Amino acid sequence: HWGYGKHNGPEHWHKDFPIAKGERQSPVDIDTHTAKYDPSLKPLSVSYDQATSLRILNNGHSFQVTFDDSQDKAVLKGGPLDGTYRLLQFHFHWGSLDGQGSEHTVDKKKYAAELHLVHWNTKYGDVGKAVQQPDGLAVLGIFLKVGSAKPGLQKVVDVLDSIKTEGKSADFTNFDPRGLLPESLDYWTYPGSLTTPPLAECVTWIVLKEPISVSSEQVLKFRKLNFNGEGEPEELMVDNWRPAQPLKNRQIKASFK
């Protein structure tokens, strides 16, 4: 099955998922000088005060924190979106070294990691129906650079030792995703895809201009996780990012001058 190694990595995915070579694939390079400022874009509305985190899980390609999406508790609206999108989960993509790990790039610059907050359009009732729609999902992407620690991330990194290998999970309640957001909600947006199989072309991407800073000790804890299950040869969970895909007939818009 698919992964991030030499023999099953991103250059192989198109064999099982031919949409990998489609017209609106993600991630992409964000050319900041070619993005078009669109003063008709609204501010993003991030309403996370009633978020209910449930569990944290090593799924073999990342780790994810999952939320109760049975009600409008933590929702994204506005920006380029029509309607209301419910937070399902967040996860990260990261590198073996600090100069790579993000999926999106900015003027070809790679960041150490990229946070994805995954939301689905309540129009479609469940995330399985939403992935089959061109406007089914909205993913909020946030870049991580290495420097000062992000205090709001520490509760996450401290439990990773308990989900080291594929398939492990743990309860993970009362985690507040607002402690992962940067000051500014200035963003770029473009139509795209999931960055892991099935690579469905169902995502409105909203990528924040301002990265968050995390400490070296925080990102090193990411790099101790395992792709493998317990009892298999240890393969560190690093470089779990898809590289930039061709922009083709798309324009990236900016909410900011």
Binding-site entries for substrate: 195-196
Q: Which residues contact 233 (CB under 8 A, 6 or more apart)?
A: none
Kindly name the residue from 1, 61, 104, 119 that is annotated as catalytic.
61
Which one, 72 or 147, has the nearer CB to ligand CQS? 72
33 is catalytic: no
Which one, 196 or 226, has the nearer CB to ligand CQS? 196
Q: What Rg, from alpha-carbon coordinates, does the chain have?
A: 17
Q: Closest Cα to residue 222, out of 150, 137, 125?
A: 150
Q: Which residues contact 83 (CB under 8 A, 6 or more apart)?
A: 77, 121, 122, 123
- In SS3 terms, 179-229 reads as HHCCCCCCEEEEEECCCCCCCCCCEEEEEECCCEEECHHHHHHHCCCECCC
Q: Per rule CB under 6 A, is residue 139 in the interface with ligand CQS?
A: yes
> Are residues 188 and 175 in contact, defined by beta-carbon separation less than 8 angstroms?
no
The residue count for binding Zn ion (CB under 5 A) is: 1
**What is the distance between the alpha carbons of residues 104 and 50, in angstroms, rounded to a whole number?**
29
Residues annotated in a binding site: 91, 93, 116, 195-196
Where are the alpha helices (H) located in 112-195, listed in sequence order?
Answer: 127-130, 154-159
Token duo for residue 27: 């991630």
User: Nearest to Zn ion by Cβ — which residue?
Assistant: 116
Q: Per rule CB under 6 A, is residue 127 in the interface with ligand CQS?
A: yes
Which span (37-45, 78-86, 171-179, 193-201) binds ligand CQS, by CB under 6 A? 193-201
Nearest-approach distance from CB 5 to Zn ion, in angstroms? 18
Which one, 46 or 233, has the nearer CB to ligand CQS? 46
The residue within the footprint of Zn ion, chosen from 116, 150, 209, 221 (CB under 5 A), is 116
Q: Which does 252 bind (CB under 5 to 8 A by kind): ligand CQS, Zn ion, none?
A: none
**What is the distance between the alpha carbons of residues 138 and 116, in angstroms, rounded to a whole number?**
10
Q: Per rule CB under 6 A, is residue 214 in the interface with ligand CQS?
A: no
Residues annotated in a binding site for Zn(2+): 91, 93, 116
Q: Which does 46 bind (CB under 5 to 8 A by kind): ligand CQS, Zn ion, none?
A: none
Which one, 116 or 119, has the nearer CB to Zn ion? 116
Distance of CA 244 to the CA centre of its chain: 14
**What is the distance between the alpha carbons of residues 107 and 83, in angstroms, rounded to a whole number?**
31
The residue within the footprint of ligand CQS, chosen from 25, 53, 58, 66 (CB under 6 A), is 66
Question: Which residues of this chain interact with Zn ion, rule CB under 5 A?
Answer: 116
Question: Which residues of this chain interact with ligand CQS, rule CB under 6 A?
Answer: 66, 88-89, 116, 118, 127, 131, 139, 194-196
The set of catalytic residues is: 61
